Design a binder for this molecule. Structure first.
Ligand code: ADP
Ligand code: ADP
Ligand code: ADP
Ligand code: ADP
Ligand code: ADP
Lengths: 367, 374, 367, 374, 367
């Protein structure tokens, strides 16, 4: 895509609220992709992706930026927990990214084949018509062996139209050129002064960012120009605790601000397909019409902020648990309330929540 | 390649700055490869690669020399962290991953030779349906013109490239080429070898050395692409050796590293050179990148001087990461231009010393913030 | 081979310097091989190889004796570090030995097929003419499955002349009859009083020497008559610390003496293809002629002995690091010095080395 | 085999010296196999092998009895160290490795039967090209004579041995024979079982016993060669039992070892017998080996007496390894003759008591040296 | 089978001596099987097997009851040591049970094909006539791959008569309906207050009893209606120490009494194919006739009880070691004693045993 950095941020504002510095940082990395293609043969090999390190408390949108970014560029995407490797091989990151790129380009290939998939009597009828047991590591291998053994109209036409050798070669080029990976909670593999096992994971991840080659059943993939987005609260450790070889491979740094009560009020409504809009369409399925007052949206955001300050701050994720606890009575009766217009006023919010928010011992369970 | 040792160093000077001793040492190893092939049948077996042990602080260009060296020789290359084997994976995976890189290397390079001939015969194939045969016919050329001018039909040209490139390629000559490329030209870089030197960990630390021993003394490893022998593979080990010393390595390993070299720490003056002198230096990279948006950036000598001073202060204020600090500092300076470069099309921007201090000095002043941002 | 023990030692003297007791011991074991074949059917099963245990400091030639011995008998050979199994199965020793025996008999089969590989116009032109992804353990298995899937003029003729069923059956008989294995640093698996894991390796190695059967993709190999050569400094532990079942399986013992300065002077020159001869041929490739004075060879041996006495004694391996440090200037300028005769006198040795040998702190790095 | 228990002991006396109780105990187990086959369908299932537990110091011939016993019965055999499973490998590998030994055993023995008939039909095949058919013809014999006299042609005789031996062999009768050989005749020796007796290690020690339990109580193990049942396999466990006792074994395991026997320690007199009396004794072995070089060695009775005394002193001076000490002492005495035997062809050497003391007493006197050399 | 609970116990009395409460408990579980089949479609899914937990010292017959029970019902059977999983997957229990069910139904299928497997000259002659190397986990997989590669008159007829698709489908129905599993020494995986690894095994076994599905090369097996019989001394821990999810899945509990001297006297003779009867038939093979006096049988039982009270009580298993120690002289001379009638009187028992039983230090080895 040829979108300029401001055009990228403007699209991210349709989903993510605030955190513009993180939006500006990801826009720079995605714009350098298009900038690299316009360069000559020599510079395209020397220039490498400007990988980003997001820093901030949980639930502030570090992942949603990476998700919407890859969804914006139609790029292959995967999220991985860095701690998973403290105990799987690191090369699986590129494998799973390709398997997602395969299904992505494949279902997209069906889209091109879908729409392809007269006598007066011809139009008349046309109008009326309208076992192999293996350990877990090789379970995917025995799958392919079983599919090889089995080998030895929408389905037959789409198979006739599709080019399987093209879809497999394309997904590699979609990964080598446009791929994106998100390494969540990278701060937890930094040295606490386990430090050998923690820093050992950093060394195992190093070739993926330094440019290496990973074999896959779909083909041979190179990790040279893949973009990476690490994230971590970095409250315990600091980015300087990362190994020097890794710090130099994350040229862009950014800190995401903690969300405020006003941000919660915006997140509930402004973003496209916001959670409040979702239940409004859900209750519309039952014939019920729900409407949230601005005071009702205010106290909901006020309720989530209190739980985060009372016990544990989980970020905007607290909005999900609170909203479902508020609408639980409506969602159950929504079948019997068909044809009725329900209003979520400030009194309705205080009725279903203030008794719960007041008891911190209960808030740790119900919310 | 038949390059003489001075020709190797001069090419390395186009990328690496300074560290001439490490350049001279790697040049001797690569020259011994060509010197060996000229020898008789007996001496070619007895002579073994002169493996090198790089020593110095991190980020001084130890790996870059090995990378540019293998790229100069078009040789298979892989960087392996010696600490990966402390936990576990088998050591033989080094040769396995090296061949996989050599497979993709010889394959993509073989596509470069097939990129040309395939288009000719693919044109001859597609012209057989337009002008079926019963000097080129005049209609054979009249269609050949409209084809090159541009035009399932359009999908068919891509399918013939595969069938012709597969017909032109010799897989037994290709999959066996990567084996010849590994056995004859292969190169391996073993980073942070000093950390496996020497009671509990000393057994597991030195155990990794003995697992690595057959690879340098010569052995044979089985791979899915074939059977590879490691007798003539060149190896480059590196380590800071501040906690331990090369003498702490097992004696069988000290004798397999005949060349030793220490790399000097980079100075502020070297940072200024790294920013500009090397071919496709990072400052040149950002210049051509902003050029893509139609902006012309230019760095003043004092502007370059203050970036190197900025990266040096962070390395001294907190942690010294070598010349890697130049990358984090530069993008932090250019982040405002890189975002606005779309709206700044047609303008000539100048990175002066005042601009560098405006965007950086406030950050370098706070060491608490430098650890997070730089 | 029908070589007598003195004929074996005489050939080993062409490579190894001194250490005659170890040369005499290996000659006895190799001669018993030929002696066993002349015996009747009963005694050939009861007699077992006289395995040897070499004892001495590192770098005194314990391995070179085993290497030249197997190279002298054209026998399959492999070196293994006993500590590798403290963390691979022990049966891999026989597998890798066969894979080396296969490549040995195979390239030797090409030698027999190589030389096999008129009209006046006939002689005239004759004159003008002149993806499957698996864990690391089964990577070799998927190789064979991939080679089976692919199955389902020098190359075509050598394949037409060779007998693949013969080469595979021969390599087994070459292993079962003439095979040799070298177990380096066996002293490190003795009990230090880990002792369970150390002695556990001794128990795992026991069936290989007591006569057992190991399966291999090339075939079923028996370890009855394979010769073994263990080695260890035995400075910490002693051979009596080995398990009793293992001590009885090593009937021959020998101690290799520490090399002296005079031995270094001999090792540099006397052995065939000595290291000094190697660089002389290497510098001859550049058109340069190097010549070492007897005083120059003396001070080189004197230099290596000082480093071994100053910090750590690595045996004759110190000669390699010292010599390359001395010739580093010549090896770099050898291109520009074409047609010149360079002499390595005693002054040249003292110029490039005495400054380094004097500083022990630097000798631990550069040498 | 239908050998009676006394016939078994008498054959074991040809190899093992003394230890008659262990010979009588193993003979009862092997005789019960033949006794079971004579029984009806019901009793053959209910009766199970009388497993034996050998007890005594190392090197007294516990394993040799089990080896000669299985070799006497031509039965599959394997020795497994019980401590191997403390770390890990599965216990079922015992039956897997046993079948692999039984596969090679029945295969090489099947080659012995095919060694004969194949040569006859291979001759009939090669005579068809010399005298193509349109009582043996006179030319059929005239070529058969020149063939047996000796002579691709020479390579062809080897290829027909494979095709005929493969045609003569019945693989379903062979690969299934090794299964019958394991199930009906299989024997397993479990060395040092006393070391897995009984808090931390006691769970892992006794855990191995419970993993071994299904093999003796009866079970079924899957192998690549087939499906094997362990109900009728004989087992022989051994251990010094100085740290622990057989009562320390798990109760389900004590009941599966109905026969118990203690092996006495070997004396100096027994060493003298071991050197000479057993068939193909080591002294006989060195005699026939020096014979190959054309030397005739002869050991005096006092010379044999002083070798046994030499091995005994080392076992008492340092570590007692049993009769294994005889091997290390003997070769150390014969190492000078074994090297010179080529030049000594045609001479009669005599190993007297003076010769034994000349080469050994200096070594036995220094206990510091005996640990390294003997 | 339609056997009533008393008919089951009456058959168990032919092998097991006493312990009637355990015989009554297993009879109830086997009778509920037949009772479930007579129920309607709904109740057959809701009713689940009444699993039993046997409690008592070792060697009192806890396993023989389970063995004879499965042999009585011709059901597939397997015994497993719960401690084996403290270090194999638990799903292997169902796999090995099916492999035993396959061989069971297969050899039973040969029985149906066995009996199927005229001119005067016809009756006359009729009268005169009368390499792939894998780690241990996938060794069974490579077996099937090797058998697939090989694929690509009693034997040919039985193969022609048998229905291989029927034998594989039947063994699953034989497991899903009639299967039985015995988990020995379940008391050792209870918490001692390892407790995580011990109770972790209890959680891994839970789905097998709670009704789950286990894949197998023979087919997909369901563990819903499989009967299970756990056993343990429960001297250290108690059944209440088991996890609550497991206690509810063992509705039947029973304690097996310690065997007395009188029971040993009965076990030696009364059970069908008793050990004394076995040696009588064994010595009959040698032409010898052995006969045990009631006083001889008495002192044998008295001897075994003394060893159990002196050192360690192994239950009725002590009878095996004692009897073989008594008959060792006869079993060796039985060949030379052909045609003789030997009597095992009380004096014969005291002669061969009292010297051994008196020495407790020797009893720990010989007996
Ligand atoms: N700025 C924001 N705008 C809109 N939604 C947000 C924002 N920040 C957080 N959220 C919501 O909260 C959740 C944040 O989770 P996530 O971004 O995965 O955590 P983190 O940011 O710690 O990686 C998302 O489900 C998202 O819908
Ligand atoms: N002499 C040099 N010339 C140019 N760039 C350098 C030099 N030394 C270091 N760099 C830069 O700093 C980084 C050094 O990292 P690397 O060489 O991998 O570390 P090490 O030298 O410790 O192995 C590289 O990204 C490289 O671009
Ligand atoms: N007696 C000798 N004669 C010739 N070269 C020797 C001798 N001893 C050692 N060397 C040299 O030193 C090295 C010895 O290493 P090696 O024999 O593998 O160590 P070790 O003897 O401890 O096993 C060899 O490369 C060999 O060239
Ligand atoms: N009674 C004996 N007769 C002959 N040789 C014996 C005897 N006892 C021991 N040996 C010799 O000593 C060694 C004993 O080792 P082994 O029997 O395996 O040990 P263990 O008896 O402890 O299992 C064998 O090599 C054997 O040749
Ligand atoms: N009541 C009994 N009747 C007959 N034999 C018994 C009885 N109890 C024990 N036995 C014998 O003792 C042994 C008991 O072992 P087992 O039942 O497996 O131990 P546990 O009962 O502890 O599981 C069996 O071999 C059996 O022959």
């Amino acid at each position: 895509s040829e979108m300029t950095p401001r055009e990228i941020v403007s699209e991210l504002d349709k989903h993510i609220i605030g955190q513009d510095n993180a939006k500006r940082s990801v826009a720079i990395a995605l714009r350098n992709r298009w900038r690299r293609m316009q360069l000559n043969e020599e510079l395209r090999h020397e220039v490498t992706p400007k990988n980003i390190l997001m820093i901030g408390p949980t639930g502030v949108g570090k992942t949603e930026i990476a998700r919407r970014l890859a969804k914006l560029a139609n790029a292959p995407f995967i999220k991985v927990e860095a701690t998973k490797f403290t105990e799987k091989e690191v090369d699986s990151i590129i494998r799973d990214l390709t398997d997602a790129a395969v299904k992505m380009v494949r279902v997209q290939a069906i889209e091109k084949n879908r729409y392809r998939a007269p006598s007066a009597a011809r139009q008349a009828f046309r109008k009326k018509l309208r076992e192999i047991m293996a350990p877990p590591g090789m379970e995917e291998m025995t799958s392919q062996l079983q599919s090889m053994f089995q080998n030895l109209l929408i389905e037959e036409e789409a198979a006739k139209l599709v080019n399987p050798e093209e879809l497999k070669q394309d997904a590699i080029d979609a990964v080598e050129q446009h791929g994106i990976v998100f390494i969540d909670q990278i701060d937890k593999i930094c040295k606490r002064g386990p430090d050998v096992s923690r820093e050992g994971v950093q060394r195992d991840l190093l070739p993926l960012v330094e440019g290496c080659t990973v074999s896959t059943k779909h083909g041979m993939v190179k990790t040279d120009h893949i973009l990476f987005i690490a994230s971590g609260a970095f409250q315990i450790a600091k980015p300087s605790d990362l190994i020097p070889e890794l710090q130099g491979r994350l040229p862009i740094r950014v800190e995401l601000q903690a969300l405020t009560t006003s941000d919660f009020e915006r997140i509930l409504t402004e973003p496209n397909a916001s959670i409040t809009v979702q239940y409004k369409a859900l209750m519309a399925t039952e014939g019920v019409n729900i409407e949230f007052t601005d005071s009702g949206i205010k106290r909901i955001a006020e309720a989530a902020w209190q739980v985060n300050e009372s016990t544990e701050n989980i970020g905007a994720r607290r909005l999900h648990t609170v909203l479902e606890r508020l609408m639980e009575e409506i969602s159950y009766d929504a079948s019997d309330l068909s044809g009725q217009n329900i209003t979520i006023d400030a009194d309705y919010v205080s009725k279903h929540l203030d008794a719960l928010v007041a008891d911190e011992d209960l808030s740790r369970f119900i919310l």
